[PDB]
Amino acid sequence: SNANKYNKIANELIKIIGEDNIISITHCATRLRVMVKDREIINDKKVEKVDEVKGVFFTSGQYQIILGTGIVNKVYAEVEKMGLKTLSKKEQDEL
């Protein structure tokens, strides 16, 4: 596939969750982890249909999208430019 593969998934994901429904975002080795305001407006079935999405779970305020290793980082790197509160990239330590 073309090099926009990961930015299309990021955009589809943001669009289904709702941009202003996102508190903050990070990831682990296999999952994109989105702290959301209201899970009950997120259409899980539409999320599950997105390219590369292996499954979805909500628990403990976290909407988790399983993308698999390597694919999860490439999607995270697209979301990182979108301006949402992404957290993985911890902020500069002061001296």
DSSP state of 86: B
Domain assignment present for residue 86? The answer is no
- State how many domains the chain has: 1
Q: What is the resolution of this structure in A?
A: 1.2
Does residue 93 sit within a domain?
Answer: no
Instruction: Answer whether 27's CB lies under 8 Å from 34's CB.
Output: no
In a domain, 36, yes or no: yes
In a domain, 94, yes or no: no
Rounded Cα distance, 13 and 92, in Å: 28
Residue 38 included in any domain: yes
Question: Which residue in the list 15, 18, 23, 28 is annotated as catalytic?
Answer: 28
DSSP 89: S
Question: How many degrees, rounded to 5, is the angle at CA 93 between CA 34 and CA 69?
Answer: 35
| Distances in whole angstroms, Cα of residue 24 to Cα of each of 8, 35, 47, 51 | 19, 5, 18, 22
Terminal CA-CA length for the chain: 44
CATH of the domain at 33: 3.30.1360.60
Cα R_g (the chain), whole angstroms: 13
- Is 60 inside a domain boundary? yes
Residue list, annotated binding site: 28, 40
Q: Which residues are annotated binding-site positions for Zn(2+)? A: 28, 40
Whether 28 is catalytic is yes
Q: Provide the residue type at 66 as one letter.
A: I
Q: Identify how many contiguous H helices and E strands the chain contains and give both numbers.
A: 3, 4
Residue 5 resides in a domain: yes
Burial label, 66 (beta-carbon count in 10 A; 0-12, 13-18, 19+): middle
Enter the tokens of residue 89.
Answer: 């990239």
**Strands 55-59 and 22-27, bridge-based pairing:** unpaired
Residue 36 lies in domain: 1-80
